[PDB]
Design a protein around this ligand. Sequence first.
Ligand SMILES: Cc1cc(C)cc(Nc2nccc(-c3c(-c4ccc(Br)cc4)ncn3C3CCNCC3)n2)c1
Length: 124
Amino acid sequence: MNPPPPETSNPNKPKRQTNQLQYLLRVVLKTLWKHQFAWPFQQPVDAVKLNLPDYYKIIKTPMDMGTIKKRLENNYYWNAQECIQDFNTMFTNCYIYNKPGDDIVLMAEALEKLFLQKINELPT
Ligand SMILES: Cc1cc(C)cc(Nc2nccc(-c3c(-c4ccc(Br)cc4)ncn3C3CCNCC3)n2)c1
C-alpha cells in the first residue's frame, strides 16, 4: 500500500503570512510546477501504480510538490525555512532512491537548479 500523504492542514499548528512564503507559492512553486520535468514531482509517489514495493521502505520522509502547494495555500508553514526544507527533502528522496544519471535524477537536478536560482532571489 501507499502511506497516507503528508499532513497539509493542522488546526492546532499556528499560521502566518510572510512575503517570503508568498514568494515561495506565487513564484517558486508556480515556476517549478510548470517546468517540463515537474510531472513526477506533482503528487506523492504512487508506489502501487508504479510497482515500487521498496519505495516507502527506503523513503521514510516522503515529500512532493502537491503537498508543498497545499501546505503553502493552507498557511501551514510558520517560516520560509520549513518550506525550503520540504523542497530539499523531496529532491533528496529522489536522489537516495535512484542512481546518478537516471532520467528521474536528471529531472530532479534540473528542477533543483531552478529552485536554487529562485531561492537566491528570495525577498526580505
Ligand atoms: C516509466 C517512468 C519513467 C520515469 C523516469 C518516471 C515515471 N514516473 C514516475 N512517477 C513518480 C515517481 C517516479 C520515480 C521516482 C521519484 C519521483 C519523485 C520523487 Br519525490 C521521488 C522519487 N523515482 C524513480 N521513479 C521511477 C523511475 C523509473 N521507473 C521507476 C520509478 N516516476 C515513469
